[PDB]
Design a binder for these strands. Sequence first.
RNA 1: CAAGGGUAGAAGGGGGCCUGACUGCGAGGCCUGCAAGCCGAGCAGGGGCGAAAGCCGGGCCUAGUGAACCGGUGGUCCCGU
RNA 2: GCUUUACUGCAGCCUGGUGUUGGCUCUUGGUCGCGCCUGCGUAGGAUAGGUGGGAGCCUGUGAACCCCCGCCUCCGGGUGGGGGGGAGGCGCCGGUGAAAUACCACCCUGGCGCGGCUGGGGGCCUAACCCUCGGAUGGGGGGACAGCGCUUGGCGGGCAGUU
RNA 3: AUAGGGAGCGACGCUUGCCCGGUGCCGGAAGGUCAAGGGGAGGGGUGCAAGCCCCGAACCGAAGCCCCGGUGAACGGCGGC
RNA 4: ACCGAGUCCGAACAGGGCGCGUCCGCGGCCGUGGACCCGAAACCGGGCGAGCUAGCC
RNA 5: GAACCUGGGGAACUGAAACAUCUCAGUACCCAGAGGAGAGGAAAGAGAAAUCGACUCCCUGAGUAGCGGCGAGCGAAAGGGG
RNA 6: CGCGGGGUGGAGCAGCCUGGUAGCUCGUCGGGCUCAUAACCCGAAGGUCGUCGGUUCAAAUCCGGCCCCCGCAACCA
Lengths: 190, 144, 93
Amino acid sequence: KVYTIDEAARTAKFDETVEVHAKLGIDPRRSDQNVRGTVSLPHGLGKQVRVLAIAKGEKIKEAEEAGADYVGGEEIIQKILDGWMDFVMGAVGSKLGRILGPRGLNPKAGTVGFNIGEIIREIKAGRIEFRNDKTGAIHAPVGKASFPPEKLADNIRAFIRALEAHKPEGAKGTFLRSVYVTTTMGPSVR
Amino acid sequence: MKVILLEPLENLGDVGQVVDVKPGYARNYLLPRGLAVLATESNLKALEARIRAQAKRLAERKAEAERLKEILENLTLTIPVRAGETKIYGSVTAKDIAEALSRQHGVTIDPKRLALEKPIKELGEYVLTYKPHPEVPIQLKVSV
Amino acid sequence: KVCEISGKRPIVANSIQRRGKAKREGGVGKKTTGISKRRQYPNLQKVRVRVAGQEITFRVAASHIPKVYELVERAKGLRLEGLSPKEIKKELL
RNA sequence: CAAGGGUAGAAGGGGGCCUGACUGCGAGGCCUGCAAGCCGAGCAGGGGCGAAAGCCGGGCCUAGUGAACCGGUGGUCCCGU
RNA sequence: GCUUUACUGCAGCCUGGUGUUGGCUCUUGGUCGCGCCUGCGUAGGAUAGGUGGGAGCCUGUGAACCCCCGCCUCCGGGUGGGGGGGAGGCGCCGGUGAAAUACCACCCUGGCGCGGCUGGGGGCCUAACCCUCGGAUGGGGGGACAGCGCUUGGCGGGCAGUU
RNA sequence: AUAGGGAGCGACGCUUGCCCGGUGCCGGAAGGUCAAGGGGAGGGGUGCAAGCCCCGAACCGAAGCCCCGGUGAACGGCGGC
RNA sequence: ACCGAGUCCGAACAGGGCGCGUCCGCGGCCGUGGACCCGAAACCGGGCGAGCUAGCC
RNA sequence: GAACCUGGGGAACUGAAACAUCUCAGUACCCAGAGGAGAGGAAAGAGAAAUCGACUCCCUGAGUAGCGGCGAGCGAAAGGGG
RNA sequence: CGCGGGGUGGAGCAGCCUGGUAGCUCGUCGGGCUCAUAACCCGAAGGUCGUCGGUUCAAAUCCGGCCCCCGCAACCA
Ligand SMILES: [Mg+2]
Ligand SMILES: [Mg+2]
Ligand SMILES: [Mg+2]
Ligand SMILES: [Mg+2]
Ligand SMILES: [Mg+2]
Ligand SMILES: [Mg+2]
Ligand SMILES: [Mg+2]
Ligand SMILES: [Mg+2]
Ligand SMILES: [Mg+2]
Ligand SMILES: [Mg+2]
Ligand SMILES: [Mg+2]
Ligand SMILES: [Mg+2]
Ligand SMILES: [Mg+2]
Ligand SMILES: [Mg+2]
Ligand SMILES: [Mg+2]
Ligand SMILES: [Mg+2]
Ligand SMILES: [Mg+2]
Ligand SMILES: [Mg+2]
Ligand SMILES: [Mg+2]
Ligand SMILES: [Mg+2]
Ligand SMILES: [Mg+2]
Ligand SMILES: [Mg+2]
Ligand SMILES: [Mg+2]
Ligand SMILES: [Mg+2]
Ligand SMILES: [Mg+2]
Ligand SMILES: [Mg+2]
Ligand SMILES: [Mg+2]
Ligand SMILES: [Mg+2]
Ligand SMILES: [Mg+2]
Ligand SMILES: [Mg+2]
Ligand SMILES: [Mg+2]
Ligand SMILES: [Mg+2]
Ligand SMILES: [Mg+2]
Ligand SMILES: [Mg+2]
Ligand SMILES: [Mg+2]
Ligand SMILES: [Mg+2]
Ligand SMILES: [Mg+2]
Ligand SMILES: [Mg+2]
Ligand SMILES: [Mg+2]
Ligand SMILES: [Mg+2]
Ligand SMILES: [Mg+2]
Ligand SMILES: [Mg+2]
Ligand SMILES: [Mg+2]
Ligand SMILES: [Mg+2]
Ligand SMILES: [Mg+2]
Ligand SMILES: [Mg+2]
Ligand SMILES: [Mg+2]
Ligand SMILES: [Mg+2]
Ligand SMILES: [Mg+2]
Ligand SMILES: [Mg+2]
Ligand SMILES: [Mg+2]
Ligand SMILES: [Mg+2]
Ligand SMILES: [Mg+2]
Ligand SMILES: [Mg+2]
Ligand SMILES: [Mg+2]
Ligand SMILES: [Mg+2]
Ligand SMILES: [Mg+2]
Ligand SMILES: [Mg+2]
Ligand SMILES: [Mg+2]
Ligand SMILES: [Mg+2]
Ligand SMILES: [Mg+2]
Ligand SMILES: [Mg+2]
Ligand SMILES: [Mg+2]
Ligand SMILES: [Mg+2]
Ligand SMILES: [Mg+2]
Ligand SMILES: [Mg+2]
Ligand SMILES: [Mg+2]
Ligand SMILES: [Mg+2]
Ligand SMILES: [Mg+2]
Ligand SMILES: [Mg+2]
Ligand SMILES: [Mg+2]
Ligand SMILES: [Mg+2]
Ligand SMILES: [Mg+2]
Ligand SMILES: [Mg+2]
Ligand SMILES: [Mg+2]
Ligand SMILES: [Mg+2]
Ligand SMILES: [Mg+2]
Ligand SMILES: [Mg+2]
Ligand SMILES: [Mg+2]
Ligand SMILES: [Mg+2]
Ligand SMILES: [Mg+2]
Ligand SMILES: [Mg+2]
Ligand SMILES: [Mg+2]
Ligand SMILES: [Mg+2]
Ligand SMILES: [Mg+2]
Ligand SMILES: [Mg+2]
Ligand SMILES: [Mg+2]
Ligand SMILES: [Mg+2]
Ligand SMILES: [Mg+2]
Ligand SMILES: [Mg+2]
Ligand SMILES: [Mg+2]
């Protein structure tokens, strides 16, 4: 077995919910290990990708044609901290942590897709995909999936999660690669 | 501690088996009492000699005791001892049947082995059995 | 003493006492704080066995113990009969 | 800080920048059985203070120390059966 | 020559591990393949442990009232075994909370029943070994102990060499 | 065991006090420390590799020593102003 | 390592440290051998002694 | 059975200007055995060579390589010539 | 010098065995009150938990730098 059959992940109404779990070093030293949210992924899910990437206020026009259905600007600033937990944004770029009511009061706060104009470009690949998480005081890794619309496309997690790790100092060994959830379980050799 | 058993005993397979034990157990109990022997190639090999010369020497009762059905199975008997209206002549008995179990031809004969519950002493078309491997029920015709 | 089956006998070895921590670690090294002469005897054990008429007994290293039993099978190819615990022994190889 | 020799034409008291309590060397000497101990101009590197001349390779000076061997660390052009 | 809490050994004695060294057991360990457990300040049908997915598992594989009655404690049920037996409940949605209850993956802080790898503590036996008995290829007793081999650490003027 | 070994005292008479801190010896199935051995988290050496070699934490590991207590016809000790 | 009338330390076309017979005889002295000669008290090995003396049978 | 040889055991004085590792020394000596010799002997060798080719004995290598309270002191082998 | 066990009211000093709890005698102060004294009795000052820091609504607890006293195999040219 030099590989792992890309087919067998068959309790749902459309299986594309398969996850990707793991387990390396638990709370190494006094730090740990966190994974970036919307990196890219070799595919791009299929759910309502509301990348509310709250970037410049100039992200309502062209920033809603190749990224997300609704992208915050400057009208959804402190008008989201005084209108209940209804009015999850991300953050901005550069050295100006403008967390007025989207990255301080509690969800995302990564950054803004370096464009400083809008969000419809085509020099990237992480507009409508799957986010991520982090450790867990016991477990780690965390993610979603890639996309269900091909053949051997089930090996998209063996290169975006099972073949892409560079955020750990010194611990011991990252042995797990046991993925697939909300349906089956592919704890094979990933 | 490879050892070949004899009179089989619990915790250890049936006779003539290559079961493992504890050196002490064998040297001070088994061997002494003749309840086993050492798996010395010298015997371990002389065992297969008990096998082939029993397993490959079995095509006789299993593959040849059978020919006592290839010839004397599909061949009528008919009692050459007539009768009354229904109670047969000669009483038709294990003997008056075994006398010519081989006479009819010349390959095998037998007297005791017969599913003959009670002496027929009654006309008819009887067909009982024999033994011990595949049971061979021969066709006997108690004629009148 | 000495094994009848393998000829093993006691040998002279040297009881060497050392002091200090090795070089494999801390440093400086070990120092012989003495060396006495001594002997190491072979693990001789007594082994009684039935074989033939009489039951004879061998004295042998614990290592060469089996060798005596395998030495009894082979015995089965010999004409013993004569009642003599001694001779039967010599008669083994 | 012991005593002594020295010293206000500072080696003493105060302040401002600094780290030469440099690295590589070292003419020539003092002392001396050996090996040790002591002083040192000057050259190169890279500095420090000064406008500069220049001074700085610890401390007014003389005690404040321990050959080798065996090991411990950190490095480095070396040897590596 | 002698002495000792002078140094360093040695004899001797004590001691763990293995060897000679075996049966049958009951009882518990370390822990890796397992099966399910748990956290009860507020929201709360309840006891939600987490990271995240997250809207069907369920149904003649019998989804609801019903009874024997195991478990644990924060006494709520978490939970579960037999028959009548039924054709639908859970939950997204909501209250709410720093996180939300259908579901599945994979983590354990404690825990745990079916079993391997395996170590301890008891018992019993007998056949090694040991002792005995008007000779015994046998019977008593001890018994995997003791003895003896290799190896661990220790006490050690009894003795040795020396300062 | 009214016997056998070791020790001191030494017919007989009257007696033989106090001190278990230290030393010795006796008793302590708890704790602490402790060797080989078991165990292996984790780390290293090479190899294209399977691998083959090494170090190695936690925890389990006796006697002994520490600790608790006893003991003087045991070694000994039995005040000053 | 290696370089070589040079080489080493050094960054250094500064400095400074080191850079030209064999064989036999004979004689003096030195090293290892008792080593100028005689001399211990003692230490170790293998034996010989209880016809003296001590104890016991 | 004078020495000689092989194996099994195996000191101390002394030296280190004390002494214990070390040295003397596998010497002295005890024991067994062999024989006119004894031992060893036809590679599971040597060690760096496109190599050598049983064993033993002599000369060299060599007071070298190394060992060593790196003290006192101990001290090879390959290769080469016989 | 190497593992790894804890510092707390002035002092004696429990939780850390599974994270919100500031535990108690003696001692200090008044009282109750007795023969003096004393057990006792009730109220009570008396612990940023060494602290730069991660962890949380809350951190002495999950735990890193070692700061220090006890324990401290062994080593020591
Ligand atoms: Mg065994
Ligand atoms: Mg010592
Ligand atoms: Mg010696
Ligand atoms: Mg000696
Ligand atoms: Mg063995
Ligand atoms: Mg003056
Ligand atoms: Mg000044
Ligand atoms: Mg000089
Ligand atoms: Mg100068
Ligand atoms: Mg200068
Ligand atoms: Mg000064
Ligand atoms: Mg000074
Ligand atoms: Mg000054
Ligand atoms: Mg020295
Ligand atoms: Mg090299
Ligand atoms: Mg004398
Ligand atoms: Mg003895
Ligand atoms: Mg032992
Ligand atoms: Mg033992
Ligand atoms: Mg018993
Ligand atoms: Mg018995
Ligand atoms: Mg007997
Ligand atoms: Mg008996
Ligand atoms: Mg018994
Ligand atoms: Mg035993
Ligand atoms: Mg010892
Ligand atoms: Mg010992
Ligand atoms: Mg001693
Ligand atoms: Mg003495
Ligand atoms: Mg003495
Ligand atoms: Mg001497
Ligand atoms: Mg001295
Ligand atoms: Mg008595
Ligand atoms: Mg007595
Ligand atoms: Mg007496
Ligand atoms: Mg007296
Ligand atoms: Mg007297
Ligand atoms: Mg009186
Ligand atoms: Mg008295
Ligand atoms: Mg008295
Ligand atoms: Mg008194
Ligand atoms: Mg009194
Ligand atoms: Mg006392
Ligand atoms: Mg006492
Ligand atoms: Mg006491
Ligand atoms: Mg004591
Ligand atoms: Mg005791
Ligand atoms: Mg203990
Ligand atoms: Mg160990
Ligand atoms: Mg070990
Ligand atoms: Mg191991
Ligand atoms: Mg490992
Ligand atoms: Mg103990
Ligand atoms: Mg002590
Ligand atoms: Mg007690
Ligand atoms: Mg007690
Ligand atoms: Mg005491
Ligand atoms: Mg005393
Ligand atoms: Mg020069
Ligand atoms: Mg001279
Ligand atoms: Mg001379
Ligand atoms: Mg001379
Ligand atoms: Mg003299
Ligand atoms: Mg004399
Ligand atoms: Mg002598
Ligand atoms: Mg003698
Ligand atoms: Mg004599
Ligand atoms: Mg006499
Ligand atoms: Mg006499
Ligand atoms: Mg010899
Ligand atoms: Mg000596
Ligand atoms: Mg000397
Ligand atoms: Mg001398
Ligand atoms: Mg002397
Ligand atoms: Mg000597
Ligand atoms: Mg020697
Ligand atoms: Mg020697
Ligand atoms: Mg020898
Ligand atoms: Mg010899
Ligand atoms: Mg001789
Ligand atoms: Mg002879
Ligand atoms: Mg010859
Ligand atoms: Mg020969
Ligand atoms: Mg050959
Ligand atoms: Mg050849
Ligand atoms: Mg050969
Ligand atoms: Mg070589
Ligand atoms: Mg030394
Ligand atoms: Mg030598
Ligand atoms: Mg040669
Ligand atoms: Mg030659």
